[PDB]
Write a protein that binds this ligand. Structure first.
Ligand SMILES: C[S@@+](CC[C@H](N)C(=O)[O-])C[C@H]1O[C@@H](n2cnc3c(N)ncnc32)[C@H](O)[C@@H]1O
Lengths: 288, 1057, 163, 326, 49, 50
């Protein structure tokens, strides 16, 4: 409550000036997604240290991504469409073939070190029985080992899938620079002189058969009830490398459908492009 | 000196160790030390811990295993106290021992480890392709030729380049990196031309004009702001380098042009680079606030473009358009041709534009550090303001600046105890004279003293002046800072007066330490307390002169009459706690115990008695003049019958009052008392309430009576006020060259761009005007200005409005100051007593110069840098004859001034006295131009020759100042020798050699034998009120004490024909 | 001497800062000092701790979030010995850093922040109609002519007065 | 970096004038040498050495060591007014109290003062102050200002000098220490040369140290330095004005000017402070009137002047220390 | 709100003198259609800057 | 506000009251489980008030 007090008093959100320094709202206010398109960012994810509320700052520093910013090399070689002048994508995790210990599992374990001490603090403050404490602590260790198991299948096998998928023709926009504190997606619009512009990106409420709603709970099945090819314990299932041709052919099909789609409207608009006009008095300044 | 000289070399390749050194470069055996292995500072105000490692380690990307070390957890052991050395040192020793770089030792003498690549390899736990390349073949890191070091990695990996992230130089900032460097394959110059030409198509990318290891690398920015801060820091580096390259000094810096080239960037970067390449800034050793840098430089673009001549403006626009170009001075390119001639393989950024001309523009001042500027504005300059718009200063908060009614004193502790007496002069008191003075007394009493003198008397109250000094004495005591002062010494009395508790002494020299459990409350003084203390000091110093300890003699007593004398008796009693049998009685109406409460006249049965009596009784006010006369008479009678030594206050010191007092003492004792009119320095500066010391002596007192004494003249020349006194207005708008303004000040704030104009207009009225900004963020400059009558009497001699506005333009924006802290200016500032004396003299002369007819000009001999000018009316021509007044003939011609920069000749034959002219001779007779003192006979020769030259001309009026001899015998007796002090019998003004003094009777004698008409005249109290109100000056306390004696004893001679 | 003489002026309007000053008037960077930022005395006999803030802060209505700060809990660390400077100074520095007045910086030289209204606005967590009036339009707090400073609030709120 | 005794840094070395008269042809013969040496600048090698071995870098390890012993409490004994005390005032940015005349007040337990910030010309100004107290009288052990006396320090960025001087004299009563010059933050007054005509600076001492504007006519630097010495001499009985371009003609025209102003000749001497940059030819000139007539008022072939005169246009670019390996 | 305060300070209504110049009330008052048939005009449509 | 000032104050009220009941429990040698129970019921009321 005190940590949260100093925190929320600093401001629920902030912006970035031309100087580049963060300036906070100083004002408690629930985040709404409209703000995502604006100059505002949520304050927990700012990672500007705050005196007297360091605990929240540490727990928020548990949220920092472990991956890296891959350049979309192959997609550029193949001249696939790309809205950014330098295409890039954030891979969630690096490959780590050599080490005795996965750096990802190690970091998650330190995350559960911090979280476990936070839950022990909360338990002793709230006069809890030692047995129920042993139980939450044991469940925490349990997750730590389960993560130790799947960490290879992520760092070594999902990372490649994120990279090849990074190169696909249709993944044209940049998604994330990997820095939560200052990221803002580039926002192109289809402006018209003769109408209101259409943002490519907005909260239009087309949930796309429910796609845009995000269930975070998906981490539970993923950690704790799904096998991976890379983690046999050891059947040694052979890894699958998918034929490019399927995803390629659907990408290309989407593309040609799109051009042919725009075509008739785009033709007439060219024919009439000079047709917009302004009323104009012509005052005469000569005898004849 | 013309050509640049520099020993260029790649510092980064130099920093890289030979491979055998790598095992020991972590120094496993020896403990790391500050100033070498590292440096750490705790910025106490920001509560931040900055730790920068040094040597090869200074460029190092920490592994996530490296961040898990305690050494990085150290700042979180705090806030707030700085990490003790011993924890930091050893933790650093631990993490430094932890780092084990992969390498291959080799016996060859030409190899150096690729520090960057090996550190980056380790940092990723060797999972990067460059990392595993280092693992399977560590010997690859070794290299001779610096360039091939990265080449062998490029060829081995088959890759076109490599991206290395950069850490903050501070290693306690675990935060997102601003950008990342991208080493490129290069190696021929042509591959570089291609890589850059291609680089124009990217987004937030920049390169240096030359690269380390001769391998091309391009920074890539996460965001335009990070780019802006980088470009800024590097523009600053290039400026600091160029600033000494132009001075011709040898430069060991890595590259000739430390500025970045924006291969692809936002507008703000292009403009930062454009303004950055022009080198607008003047050289500056002042520390900068490095954090606000970008903003500052952007403001500088915002100013440089805002005021440059159209060709310069177009040049900056060209620069802003060809941002990928590297603009550079011819000398720079000459240096590049030198380094290419030396090392042909070297790569350099190709797309440069040489400057055939280094642009002709003023350097801009830039001190981003703390400190308000105090401009000493000049009356005239290059700019001619034919008609300027009124400038409206936006009103100031008191948070940014306050304005107190009066400036508090800043003074030595001994100075506050400084009495200045006046001995009686006349030998007899004829009966008609008593009537003639009685009318002046009854009239001055029944029709009260001037509202202006009384307002000043009651505005600059002495307690408010003394308080910051007396409070500072207290704060050092309670924190234990003081511990040494002699018993009976004035500093001891001051401690007794600064603290409400007993002061024990473990020894005669050492103060007893404050008991550990408590802090004594501050002493409570009423306004008349300190004055009573100074009168006590005056009594011990009048009883005998040489005394060092002001302690009461044993088995002796003293009484202090008057209302609210309690704090005085308390400080006195506790001051004398050590001496045996020291009674210190108190008296007066409204007097709490210890003091007896009694009313004047004292009860007839009561018989007070002591060795000393500091009477200080106040007037009842609501009474007949006969009443105050009989009452003060009985007060002095009782005050004298009881004590051998006395010091009675006189509230209404008429010559008749005081002379009737001496008449009364002779009426009581037979033999005359040895009286003197004392005036304590701790007394209120404008009060005319002088004391009279009284003591019988075995010798008859020749010349018992006073007349025209300075202490009396403070009260006599005060009269009924003609008009209500000027009240210091604080106007904001600055009209251009408009004469009308009240005495007072010019507070306000105004935008920095209109700021130089503000000072260009402010110059018309103000001798100086302090200016500052609250912060680098603020667009406004706060500005304060006193209004001095002299400068107004200089700038308004003509309609011309010249100013140094062009120079003031250089101060915008960073050259105007910065001060987050409050400033407190005063409606009445302090100034030295002698300057005030010159003001009273200049008023006494100026208000006579207006009344006279016909005389066209004022020839003020000795008027250094136009000090005399306030005397002169605006229509009049003004001529100075001082061989020390520097000559600008343009200003002589501009303000209708004429200045003969030759010594004036005092010989009668060569003297060039003229009809219809006013000759000022203010303090010139006392000194030769070199500053040596003139012997009194030579001064008699000077006055004789000037009156002789004046005998033969019409409408001529001279004002020759002279120091009287009778002051010496005064000042020898008085203790207040500050500023004005006797030495070897010659009076010494501050910042002057002592000068021999003339006798007044001898002066009137030579002036009467010459036969010329003459009038001795001295500035009066109304003149004092006039100067102190008009200038905004307030009287000093010791200055207030010394000022009456100092003024009456330096009469001006007024010759007239 | 007979006629009264005085330089009358509104000290409260004088105490109010210009809007750019408001970001720094909390002095986030520098440590607060006695005799300037504040003065505190322990009346040893009454065993009471009197702390008066100085400058613009001297008129200030604390938010209930402001009272939850340790600096106000300081007297209860005692009886009885006077709070050591170092605890008081830094706790005061903490609460002073905590206050973030809503405002709009402006380049005009005549504006001054409406210190009273902004402090009262913050103090209620901006749920008063004058408070939300400050939130939706913070620039309203800025003013040149001292009187119109409250007038613009009265007209904007349509109300006959404010308590 | 220098390795030296603390007293050594405060060590002026003057040169008294020798010639008894200044014939009119000699003025022309030296005027040509002055106009030529000025319009065609001084050697790039002498200037490079002048600007390479900068004095601040030499002094710094000594001045830094004075500081580190202070903050760890290692120092505690030095006399007031002693040069070591001035050096401590110059090594630390805080007030120095004295519990007694011999014992330094112990550093308060809760804090460590920040290192003093000197610009390159600071220490030189300090050494000129020491030179002034040591020229006013010879035997003095304490370099403290006399009570009820004042001093002014003209020139850009004289702030650190005035700070170290003020804090050095914190004990003496009534010791004004004014500052002046363009680019001067408060306490120092900011003013430009020529000084404003209304302004009337005055003191017992004046350490002028005004720099040349560089971009000007020789007539300009001549008239400007002339007015600078004039103002510097009219105000103080004792003065120490820097000469940026010490031609024999410049300095002799200076003495000619002082005789033109005062009648009787001033007792000038060309001082050169030890804390001044080693290769700088910018010698100072001490100035004080005396009751005796000054026989042999003029300089010629003085060493301080010869440092500037025998310097001439460089024939070739100066050797730069190569570091060959084979 | 601020622009509002200035506008209403000028007056919520105005008349039109014989010159044709607008003359605003200086006063805030609720309008009523009782005013439609009088000299007064709503000030929002004055179209005076 | 993100948070009701009323619920916040009630929660600080239950902060004080809960520490008072823990003091009273440890002074009166109570089992840790019954303590966990009163403490849990207190948190429960805190959320119901929220
Ligand atoms: C008293 S000082 C200047 C103080 C002057 N009262 C003022 O208001 O500034 C007089 C100046 O006149 C010059 N002077 C001294 N004796 C002179 C003389 N005999 N004839 C002409 N000028 C003289 C000196 O240069 C000296 O600085």
């Amino acid at each position: 409550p005190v940590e949260y007090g100093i925190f929320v008093q600093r401001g629920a959100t902030y912006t970035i000036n031309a100087a580049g320094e963060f300036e906070f709202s100083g004002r408690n206010e629930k985040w709404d997604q409209a703000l995502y398109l604006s100059e505002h960012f949520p304050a927990l994810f700012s990672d500007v240290p705050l005196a007297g509320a360091n605990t929240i700052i540490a727990i928020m520093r548990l949220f920092t991504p472990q991956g890296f910013l891959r350049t979309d090399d192959l997609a550029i070689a193949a001249n696939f469409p790309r809205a950014s002048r330098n295409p890039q994508t954030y891979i969630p995790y690096t490959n780590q073939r050599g080490t005795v210990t996965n750096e990802f599992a190690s970091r998650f374990r330190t995350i559960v070190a911090t979280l476990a001490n936070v839950v022990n603090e909360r338990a002793v403050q709230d006069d809890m029985q030692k047995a129920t404490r042993s139980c939450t602590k044991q469940w925490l260790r349990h997750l730590e080992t389960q993560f130790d198991n799947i960490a290879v299948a992520h760092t070594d096998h999902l990372s490649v899938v994120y990279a090849t998928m990074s190169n696909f023709m249709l993944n044209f926009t940049n998604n994330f620079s990997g820095n939560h504190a200052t990221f803002k997606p580039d926002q192109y619009v289809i402006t018209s002189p003769e109408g209101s512009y259409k943002p490519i990106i907005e909260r239009q409420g087309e949930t796309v058969d429910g796609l845009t709603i995000i269930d975070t709970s998906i981490v539970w099945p993923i950690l704790c009830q799904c096998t991976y090819p890379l983690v046999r314990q050891s059947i040694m299932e052979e890894i699958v490398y998918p034929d490019p041709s399927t995803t390629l052919s659907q990408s290309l099909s989407v593309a040609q459908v799109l051009s042919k789609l725009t075509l008739p409207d785009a033709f007439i608009n060219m024919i009439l492009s000079g047709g917009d006009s302004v009323v104009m008095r012509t005052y005469q300044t000569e005898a004849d | 000196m013309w050509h640049y000289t520099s020993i260029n070399n790649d510092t980064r390749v130099a920093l890289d160790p030979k491979p055998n050194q790598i095992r020991t470069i972590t120094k496993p055996n020896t403990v790391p030390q500050l100033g070498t292995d590292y440096l750490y500072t705790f910025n106490s105000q920001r509560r931040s811990h900055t730790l920068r490692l040094l040597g090869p380690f200074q460029y190092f990307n920490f592994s996530e295993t490296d961040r898990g070390h305690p050494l990085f957890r150290l700042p979180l052991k705090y806030p707030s106290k700085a990490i003790p050395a011993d924890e930091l040192i050893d933790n650093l020793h631990s993490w430094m021992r932890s780092v084990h770089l992969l390498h291959v030792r080799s016996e060859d003498n030409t190899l150096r480890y690729n520090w960057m690549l090996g550190v980056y390899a380790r940092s990723t736990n060797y999972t990067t392709p460059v990392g595993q390349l280092v693992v399977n073949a560590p010997a690859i890191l070794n290299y001779s030729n610096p360039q091939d070091a990265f080449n062998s990695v490029f060829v081995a990996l088959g890759i076109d380049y490599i991206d290395i992230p950069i850490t903050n130089s501070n290693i306690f900032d675990d935060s997102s990196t601003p950008y990342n460097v991208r080493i490129w394959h290069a190696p021929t110059m042509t591959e570089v031309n291609h890589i850059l030409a291609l680089m124009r198509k990217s987004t937030l990318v920049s390169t240096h004009s030359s690269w380390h290891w001769n391998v091309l690398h391009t920074f890539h920015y996460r965001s335009e702001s990070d780019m802006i801060d980088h470009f800024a820091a590097k523009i600053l580096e290039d400026w600091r380098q160029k600033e000494k390259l132009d001075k011709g000094a040898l430069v060991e810096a890595d590259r000739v042009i430390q500025r970045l080239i924006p291969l692809s960037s936002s507008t703000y970067v292009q403009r930062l680079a454009a303004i950055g390449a022009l080198y607008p800034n003047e050289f500056t050793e002042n520390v900068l606030d490095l954090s606000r840098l970008s903003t500052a430089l952007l403001q500088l673009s915002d100013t440089y473009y805002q005021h440059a001549n159209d060709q310069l403006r177009r040049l900056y626009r060209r620069m802003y358009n060809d941002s990928r170009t590297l603009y550079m001075t011819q000398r720079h390119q000459e240096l590049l041709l030198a380094q290419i001639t030396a090392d042909p393989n070297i790569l350099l950024y190709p797309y440069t534009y040489i400057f055939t001309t280094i642009p002709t523009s003023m350097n801009y001042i830039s001190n981003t550090g703390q400190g308000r500027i105090k401009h000493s504005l000049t009356v005239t300059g290059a700019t001619e303001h034919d008609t300027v718009a009124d400038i409206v200063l936006g009103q100031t908060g008191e948070d940014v600046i306050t304005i107190s009614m009066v400036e508090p004193m800043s003074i030595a502790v001994e100075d506050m105890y400084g009495y200045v007496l006046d001995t009686p002069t006349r030998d007899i008191w004829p009966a008609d004279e008593q009537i003639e003075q009685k009318g002046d007394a009854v009239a001055l009493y029944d029709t009260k003293t001037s509202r202006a003198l009384g307002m000043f008397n009651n505005t600059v109250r002495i307690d408010d002046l003394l308080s910051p000094l007396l409070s500072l004495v207290y704060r050092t005591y309670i924190k234990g800072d003081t511990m040494t002062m002699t018993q009976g010494s004035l500093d001891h009395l001051t401690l007794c007066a600064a603290v409400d508790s007993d002061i024990t002494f473990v020894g005669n020299r050492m103060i007893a330490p404050l008991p550990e459990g408590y802090i004594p409350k501050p002493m409570h003084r009423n306004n008349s307390t300190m004055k009573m203390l100074s009168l006590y000091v005056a009594l011990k110093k009048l009883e005998n002169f040489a005394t060092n300890s002001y302690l009461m003699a044993p088995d002796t007593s003293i009484i202090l009459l008057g209302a609210e004398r309690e704090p005085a008796v308390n400080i006195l009693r506790r001051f004398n706690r050590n001496v045996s049998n020291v009674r210190i009685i108190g008296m007066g109406d409204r007097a709490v115990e210890p003091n007896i409460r009694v009313r004047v006249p004292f009860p007839i049965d009561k018989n007070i008695s002591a060795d000393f009596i500091i009477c200080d009784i106040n007037s009842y006010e609501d009474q007949s003049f006969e009443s105050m006369f009989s009452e003060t008479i009985s007060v002095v009678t009782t005050c004298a019958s009881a004590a051998t030594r006395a010091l009675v206050k006189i509230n209404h010191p008429s010559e008749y009052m005081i002379n009737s007092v001496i008449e009364r003492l002779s009426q009581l004792g037979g033999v005359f008392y040895h009286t003197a009119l004392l005036k304590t320095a701790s007394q209120n500066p404008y009060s005319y309430e002088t004391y009279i010391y009284i003591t019988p002596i075995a010798a008859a007192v020749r010349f018992p009576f006073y007349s025209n004494s300075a202490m009396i003249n403070r009260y006599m020349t005060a009269v009924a006020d003609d008009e209500m006194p000027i009240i210091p207005s604080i106007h904001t708008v600055i009209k251009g060259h408009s004469n009308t303004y009240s005495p007072g000040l010019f507070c306000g704030c105004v935008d920095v761009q209109s700021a130089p104009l503000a000072l260009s207009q402010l110059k018309s009225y103000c001798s100086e005007a302090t200016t500052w900004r609250v912060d680098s963020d603020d667009n406004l400059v706060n500005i304060i200005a006193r209004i001095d009558p002299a400068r107004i009497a200089l700038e308004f001699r003509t309609r011309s409005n010249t100013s140094a506005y062009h120079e003031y333009q250089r101060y915008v924006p960073n050259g105007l100051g910065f001060k987050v802290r409050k400033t407190r200016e005063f409606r009445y500032m302090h100034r030295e007593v002698t300057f005030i004396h010159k003001l009273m003299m200049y008023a006494l002369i100026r208000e006579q110069i207006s009344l006279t007819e016909n005389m066209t000009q004022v020839v003020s001999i000795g008027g250094r840098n136009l000090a005399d000018i306030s005397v002169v009316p605006l229509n009049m021509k003004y001529v100075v004859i001082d061989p020390a007044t520097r000559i600008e003939t343009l200003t002589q011609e501009k303000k209708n001034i004429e200045v003969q920069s030759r010594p004036f000749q005092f010989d009668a034959a060569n003297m060039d006295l003229e009809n219809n002219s006013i000759y000022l001779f203010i303090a010139v007779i006392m000194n030769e131009p070199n500053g040596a003192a003139t012997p009194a006979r030579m001064q008699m020769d000077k006055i004789r020759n000037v009156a002789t030259a004046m005998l033969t001309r019409t409408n001529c009026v001279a004002y020759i100042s002279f120091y009287e001899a009778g002051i010496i015998t005064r000042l020898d007796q008085s203790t207040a020798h500050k500023t004005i002090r006797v030495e070897e019998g010659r009076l010494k003004v501050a910042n002057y050699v002592p000068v021999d003094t003339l006798v007044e009777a001898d002066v009137t004698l030579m002036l009467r034998d010459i036969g010329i008409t003459h009038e001795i005249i001295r500035p009066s109290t109304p003149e004092l009120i006039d100067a102190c109100s008009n200038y905004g000056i307030r009287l000093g306390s010791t200055g207030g004490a010394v000022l009456d004696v100092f003024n009456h004893y330096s009469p001006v001679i007024k010759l007239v024909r």
